[PDB]
Write a protein that binds this ligand. Structure first.
Ligand SMILES: CC(C)(COP(=O)(O)OP(=O)(O)OC[C@H]1O[C@@H](n2cnc3c(N)ncnc32)[C@H](O)[C@@H]1OP(=O)(O)O)[C@@H](O)C(=O)NCCC(=O)NCCSC=O
Ligand SMILES: CC(C)(COP(=O)(O)OP(=O)(O)OC[C@H]1O[C@@H](n2cnc3c(N)ncnc32)[C@H](O)[C@@H]1OP(=O)(O)O)[C@@H](O)C(=O)NCCC(=O)NCCSC=O
Ligand SMILES: CC(C)(COP(=O)(O)OP(=O)(O)OC[C@H]1O[C@@H](n2cnc3c(N)ncnc32)[C@H](O)[C@@H]1OP(=O)(O)O)[C@@H](O)C(=O)NCCC(=O)NCCSC=O
Ligand SMILES: Nc1ncnc2c1ncn2[C@@H]1O[C@H](COP(=O)(O)OP(=O)(O)O)[C@@H](O)[C@H]1O
Ligand SMILES: Nc1ncnc2c1ncn2[C@@H]1O[C@H](COP(=O)(O)OP(=O)(O)O)[C@@H](O)[C@H]1O
Ligand SMILES: Nc1ncnc2c1ncn2[C@@H]1O[C@H](COP(=O)(O)OP(=O)(O)O)[C@@H](O)[C@H]1O
Ligand SMILES: Cc1ncc(C[n+]2csc(CCOP(=O)(O)OP(=O)(O)O)c2C)c(N)n1
Ligand SMILES: Cc1ncc(C[n+]2csc(CCOP(=O)(O)OP(=O)(O)O)c2C)c(N)n1
Ligand SMILES: Cc1ncc(C[n+]2csc(CCOP(=O)(O)OP(=O)(O)O)c2C)c(N)n1
Ligand SMILES: [Mg+2]
Ligand SMILES: [Mg+2]
Ligand SMILES: [Mg+2]
Lengths: 559, 556, 559
């Protein structure tokens, strides 16, 4: 009687659920799983730290809508990956963290096993579900549960614990072929009731000053044509959230992005599509909303997200494609949005964009670029080459890039997200590169960059078409904070380092850009090369503000 | 300018979400919330332990389809209640545990506050969501979140922590009104796609030996006519789980319940409606399903319940009403289930029902009834008087009542549930009585009863129309296990006590029933009286088996 | 080769660690463990609810100083027991909760097993350690870990999970006899350094107005003669906490119990022996301490209890017997406490006790006793028969009994404890009765009593010499609160029930006491009978105050 083993039943189970890629770091007891994945003919990206392997999995899930799969070792490795899972879950990204674990008997008596942890129970606050496959026969059901939990409902992270002893267990090949199966419809449509849609349609039809807010949930849904058709048919101005940029082209004539403050403050009806009223929208209260409760229409797959922050006049619960399709039919033939409202916003948009053009044009000393003229080069490049992933994180490097760099295409901009995480940079590059088969540009704050910088080597090791732009201003927010005491460096200072040399140390191409013209040539050459590059863009130490746009949220002393 | 406080904002917020009743036990810091709730004109049921106030909340949620609300105090009080919240969440019953809590400053530094516990964090395993309302301005939103989490998606338990310092906060009446609001559509319809339904419909159409399993999820949905119309148009044999009894009347001619083993073992397609393929269904494998993988259609609101145990050939995700109405239109005009299959099951049901009648008809010595002839009395009474709730727990007393007592009306049978909880009895009685305003009958095993027994006094204090029947066999399973050592009583033995005397200690009516005739006359008189009663039914000590139907789950 | 099994290896392991008693409720999968415990020749007390089985274990640990052992089923049963474990842990009582659990494979994939719960992980907030013995060979090490964790350091509750499949596992008898072992010195002495003791000795020697506070930690330590010798040699006034009553006789001439307010408010040095500065002492701050930081000396085995609430001038860390023995030698030969201080307190004590004697003497209508004249009968009885356990809980029934009922002997008074738990009544009776082999009296509030009342049957089933006194006033605090609306009973009302009849229903003896003289005869007759009794003492519905002594802690409306 012929036999297979846990390694292969897991390999096959993952393949049966359409996983052909993992991101990880090897070591006991999962090295030979990693090897066999590759022997079988599938991709493994080995990283320098499991956190960045996990950030990668997380954004592969966002981009593709199937779970990014991260593989780690026990206790210390798991723990590094679970920090990313946590991130996945918070951002609603389908992701599965698989981690080897030690011996049940010793761990449960807390005797001091190798890398001892109840990893299943430690993951619980950080995922939707935390499972463990103890037995070879349950691998296919276990992976099915993991894939459904990650992709269904509100998508998110799932932990699957893989005890050391799972892998060497054996089972007949006949058995395993019966047990192996592919879940039917793991992320199903969920259609809202007619009256939910009618309540929304009523509010929109009667709006004097309506605005649509698209979040990364809408982007994730992959119904770009449906959403655009809704915005166009209704004539409603729209505002994208950070990662919703490009869902509709950022230069769409109905965009009110360039006049956000006025739009939100003065609107009567606000239509939220896959966007939470969390801190990024100031919870639907205070100055930013004109000190009043708007009439919120909200489309979301999570029923109890409704009324989380402010009352929602027209809650629509279901998947965005299903809901938007119905809302469109419900609004079909109705008058377009108030022309004096859309005109008022269009005038503001033009006036504000003209003022930004004047900033991107201004001239600075060599090695002392500002955020406008430097990122204005990236803007121009991304308008000409839109089919490229734009990774972004930092304070001033994030806020100024979201404002300046226009995305014409969807699921391309990949940023710090719901938690404002510094660290997602290089993992996001690796994953974007792996899943898209196309170039990647990263605009990195230099502090931001340090949280995943060692993964330059990983980017080089896989010869990926990634171009890292370091907005090198020599610190956190600024690089010129005075020494607190004689010969003591300030806590916000960084070395104004030669990150180009660091990249060259691992076989990458390095550049220093001291002027907008130098940055242009370097970026054009780097992207066209198709090779791992890093551009060290020299930004004025005094150019940025404390925390960028969110300087209000700081706690300062007054006594 | 006129003020209101935390107590009143909470009361208003609760009322705005259609809550008019709470079950609880008062004390620091929430006694005055309880009082003011009553002063306002709302109901408060005080219990003798918070666990049973909790079980009462849970089943009120089930029956009504809106959160049962339990109110407790900090640490020890909270813990008692969260045991019940945990049970609710496991059973999918909407419920809100409100518990007062102590000083943040002192609790967070673990300094030894009064009844110190991080109740919010201790609640998390036992509920869908654990919240804390710290500030008066957030009460309307906090209560909206609790209600929506309890009733939307898979319904279940929510914990809301109410720090002592919440209640004494003030705010302008003008502000309070502005903040107070009513959630729109807190338990929304969720509709499945055409092709999820069409896949299910084709599985059913080409079935040769189909079966419909109805779970308490289907009973909870309150779409009794949709589900009955589905059964009667397809002509498919059906089977109810313990609390799905009465959804269709248990004597409906398409019921294959009395030949369950053969139906599950021999079916090819199995349509699960609001029922999990959990231990109660042998996880969809083993001897009870004929040692093969069936083609499953499953209708459930929780997407990731699919494939939890066995591959599901046709997963239909959505609320049962929406799914069933669509599935009905998809199957309309299609031929009925194969006649040789439905005729074969009907024949085995008839023969098995005849065997049971012989057991019920038979005669035993006075004071030594068995489970058949004793529960035959309850069967007849519930066929003649079906608009009565039936609470049931125990081992032999549960399993035999589920088999013998036919339910003809939906959401009446209220039993141990997914966790096989001994302890739900008297709390279930108080809630069922409170929310229906109609009579209740409890069939309680004597061990089962002792978990909530002291709540007899609660039932008497509120003068509720509850008749408690104790299956007094003198122990757990059996009342005659021998002393392991000389003069040492065995662990399964219970005093064969005068539970009737206990009932009468608190003002209720007691009966001792030694024969079926005595049981019948007592039950008829008790139910007609509309007073709190207890019938001490004297059962043969040797009439039980080990653990009832689930004897095989024991480790020897 | 001869074989034993998991049932017996556990039975033997428990016996090897000196457990001969368990308190529990049976059912799957632990019934046959319960049976075999008894077959082997050991005690099992079956209860009506696992909570009260657990409260029993908890107080058996306090009284004996070896872990009380509670046995339950999976999920629902475990959960009821863990509520008591939590109580054990909070109060510092050595206790082990053993619970059967379901199938690892199904539970870990959350498939819906019979009574499904990760009981190991659910217990964690409620015990010192939460373990699981998965394998037969680890049973003796597992039980050793449990016994050491419960009795060592600060004592407390330990959870031990017993998977269904543990019990039918087999092992040679030879193997099991080698593996079986008895821990050496599981609750060791811990001696404080000479300078810790000298710092305390200095503070005491210089005190003008010193007071010693004994807590139940000191009582638990079982060094009654050492502690009494310290109090007598130094001449320092002393105050017992609730369960420290009787450690020294409550009528000791150095007791300042009857003048607590003045003693605490006016002292300079306060010596805390196994007593926390928690809510029971108002955290060492405010009015009760004269709005000043005393010079605290504190003896405790838990190092980091020190400075938990207020700064501790002389922290002494170690076991109380070891610490007191050294402090005595350090103070030996020194002058006794200031005579004008001890005299001032002695005058207050006499004046206050005379005023209480006048209350216990007053006359009331039949069926309308107050708390003074009713409990004054119990006082007189407990002075004449001191070798009896006194269980107590309630609001006015607790506060008035602690004040009035004097304990001459140690570890006899057993009350609501650190959390003020209503529910410990009948389990405490069963356990006290089981471990002492002597009579038990309970003074129960009627609300308090309802939380464990059904365990009257258990008390009767084991024919235990327990006398339950129900302070029957018809409610919580009072029994006369007006109907809030017409025909609606107030939330604090209870039926003024015939609890005597309830007791008679299960073979117990019942009494109604309408007068102090009737209560006296009943109590005298009940205790001497040696049989399960209940006295229904009829107390005036209007006699008590809201929450007793802790009415300040209530939250009342003012708007
Ligand atoms: C919280 C926010 C959503 C709040 O939004 P705002 O910053 O107020 O608006 P933004 O959309 O970012 O745009 C800022 C302003 O630029 C304007 N804007 C936008 N696009 C344009 C163009 N194309 N041309 C001209 N002006 C433009 C826009 O109208 C705003 O002006 P007005 O209309 O005048 O307002 C955002 O700051 C955000 O997403 N922050 C993420 C912060 C983070 O994660 N940080 C990690 C580092 S933490 C650091 O300590
Ligand atoms: C696990 C189960 C779902 C398994 O279902 P079964 O018991 O096998 O089926 P049931 O529907 O109860 O029916 C039992 C048998 O009686 C038959 N049956 C049912 N109704 C009738 C009538 N009206 N007349 C004649 N026969 C009948 C039915 O065909 C079965 O025989 P066959 O077809 O021949 O099988 C059930 O036992 C259950 O719900 N258990 C919960 C137990 C629990 O939680 N207990 C708490 C105590 S724990 C104690 O230790
Ligand atoms: C928190 C406390 C330690 C605070 O102590 P106090 O109540 O202030 O002091 P107590 O020692 O209880 O005694 C009260 C008063 O009686 C006096 N006293 C004590 N003994 C005597 C005798 N023998 N004779 C005369 N007077 C006496 C003592 O000096 C006090 O008066 P003064 O010197 O004048 O103060 C205590 O209340 C306590 O242990 N409470 C437990 C509460 C609980 O757990 N409740 C559960 C139900 S919760 C209800 O809602
Ligand atoms: N397919 C989908 N259909 C509907 N809603 C979705 C879908 N996928 C994710 N969501 C929801 O989209 C929302 C994303 O919001 P958020 O992460 O706050 O976006 P942003 O930060 O861009 O505002 C979440 O509330 C999530 O439940
Ligand atoms: N309105 C509803 N629509 C769809 N599914 C529901 C609804 N209410 C509850 N459910 C589902 O019903 C199921 C209840 O199953 P279970 O408690 O195991 O029933 P039983 O014990 O009767 O088999 C759960 O899976 C739950 O998610
Ligand atoms: N053998 C021992 N030696 C020293 N300290 C002990 C010993 N056993 C318990 N303790 C300590 O005694 C203290 C008991 O305090 P607590 O429960 O607050 O008493 P009370 O409530 O009577 O004031 C705990 O801090 C505990 O760590
Ligand atoms: C994990 C993590 N650590 C710390 C922070 C706080 N934080 C926000 S921005 C930032 C760095 C900003 O500096 P930089 O990336 O260089 O951008 P700049 O303002 O200089 O352009 C840090 C550390 C964070 N958001 N996440
Ligand atoms: C809280 C809790 N504790 C224990 C159990 C285990 N258990 C199952 S049935 C049962 C009692 C069965 O005896 P009884 O209620 O008298 O029914 P009988 O078979 O005697 O008719 C117990 C204690 C449980 N399910 N829940
Ligand atoms: C588990 C638990 N629930 C609730 C409380 C709050 N509580 C304190 S005292 C009390 C009852 C007091 O009434 P009773 O026992 O009859 O004493 P009385 O004042 O009437 O003498 C309650 C419910 C508590 N301490 N513990
Ligand atoms: Mg910087
Ligand atoms: Mg029984
Ligand atoms: Mg009372």
């Amino acid at each position: 009687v012929e036999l297979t083993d846990g390694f292969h039943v897991l390999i096959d189970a993952l393949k049966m659920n359409d996983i052909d890629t993992m991101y990880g770091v090897v070591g006991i007891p999962i090295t030979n799983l990693a090897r066999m994945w590759q022997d079988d003919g599938q991709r493994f990206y080995s990283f320098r730290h499991e956190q960045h392997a996990g950030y990668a999995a997380s954004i592969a899930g966002y981009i593709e809508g199937k779970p990014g799969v991260c593989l780690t070792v026990s206790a210390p490795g798991f723990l590094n990956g679970v920090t990313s899972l946590a991130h996945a879950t918070t951002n609603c990204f389908p992701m599965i963290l698989l981690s080897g674990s030690s011996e049940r008997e010793i761990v449960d008596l807390q005797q001091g096993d190798y890398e001892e942890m109840d990893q299943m129970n430690v993951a619980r606050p950080h995922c939707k579900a935390s499972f463990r496959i103890n037995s070879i026969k349950d691998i296919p059901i276990g992976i099915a549960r993991a894939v459904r939990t990650a992709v269904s409902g509100r998508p998110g992270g799932v932990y699957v614990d893989l005890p050391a002893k799972l892998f060497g267990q054996t089972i007949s090949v006949e058995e395993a072929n019966k047990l192996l199966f592919k879940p039917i419809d793991p992320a199903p449509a969920q259609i809202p009731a007619e009256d939910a849609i009618a309540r929304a349609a009523d509010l929109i039809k009667n709006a004097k000053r309506p605005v649509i807010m698209l979040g990364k949930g809408a982007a994730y849904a992959q119904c770009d044509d449906e959403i655009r058709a809704l915005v166009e048919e209704t004539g409603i101005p729209f505002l994208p959230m950070g990662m919703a940029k490009g869902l509709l082209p950022d230069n769409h004539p109905q965009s009110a992005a360039a006049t956000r403050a006025f739009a939100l403050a003065q609107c009567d009806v606000c239509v939220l599509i896959g966007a939470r009223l969390n801190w990024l929208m100031q919870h639907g209260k205070g100055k930013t909303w004109g000190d009043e409760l708007k009439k919120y229409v909200q489309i979301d797959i999570q029923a109890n997200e409704m009324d989380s922050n402010q009352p929602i006049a027209a809650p629509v619960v279901g998947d965005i494609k299903s809901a938007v399709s119905l809302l469109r039919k419900a609004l079909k033939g109705a008058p377009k949005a108030d022309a004096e409202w859309t005109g008022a916003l269009k005038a503001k948009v033009d006036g504000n964009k003209a003022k930004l053009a004047g900033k991107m044009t201004a001239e600075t000393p060599s090695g002392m670029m500002n955020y406008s003229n430097s990122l204005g080069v990236v803007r121009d490049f991304m308008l000409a080459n839109p089919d490229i992933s734009l990774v972004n994180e930092g304070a001033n490097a994030l806020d100024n890039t979201r404002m300046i760099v226009d995305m014409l295409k969807p699921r391309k901009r990949l940023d710090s997200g719901t938690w404002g995480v510094m660290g997602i940079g290089m993992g996001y590059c690796v994953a974007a590169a792996a899943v898209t088969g196309k170039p990647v540009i990263a605009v990195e704050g230099d502090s931001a960059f340090g949280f995943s910088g060692m993964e330059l080597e990983t980017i080089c090791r896989y010869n990926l078409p990634v171009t890292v732009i370091i907005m090198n201003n020599g610190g956190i927010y600024k690089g010129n904070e005075a020494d607190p005491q004689p010969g003591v460096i300030s806590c916000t200072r960084l070395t104004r380092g030669r990150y180009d040399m660091m990249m060259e140390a691992f076989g990458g191409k390095g550049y220093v850009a001291n002027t907008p013209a130098e940055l242009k040539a370097a970026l054009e050459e780097a992207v066209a090369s198709g090779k791992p590059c890093l551009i060290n863009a020299m930004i004025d130490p005094d150019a940025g503000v404390e925390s960028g746009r969110i300087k209000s949220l700081n706690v300062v002393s007054k006594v």
